């Protein structure tokens, strides 16, 4: 067993998928989303 106080990346789970149920691969990217920012701060305005 070894440790790592690391939270800025993964760099610890690597490998090739071998089946749509494979559970030990690397990491693939995700949908490129956007800002969608709406805070909750006592009379914020529209920005529609």
């Amino acid at each position: 067993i070894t440790n790592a106080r690391t939270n800025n990346d993964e760099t610890h789970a690597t490998g090739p998928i071998e089946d749509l149920n494979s559970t030990s691969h690397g990491r693939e990217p995700e949908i490129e989303s956007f800002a969608d920012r709406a805070e909750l701060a006592m009379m914020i305005q529209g920005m529609t």
Partner: protein, 48 residues
């Protein structure tokens, strides 16, 4: 005594040439070798 040899011989064939000329007929289109299709498969994958 000279003529009538064992090799075949010819006829008389008089000589006037009677206005000979040549026409040459060309069509238009040509060839090529690779198929060069219209529609083609193209692919893409989902796992990085």
């Amino acid at each position: 005594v000279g003529a009538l040899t064992v090799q075949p011989m010819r006829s008389i064939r008089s000589t006037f040439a009677n206005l000979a000329n040549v026409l040459i007929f060309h069509d238009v289109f040509t060839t090529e070798d690779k198929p060069s299709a219209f529609i083609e498969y193209h692919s893409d994958e989902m796992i990085v």
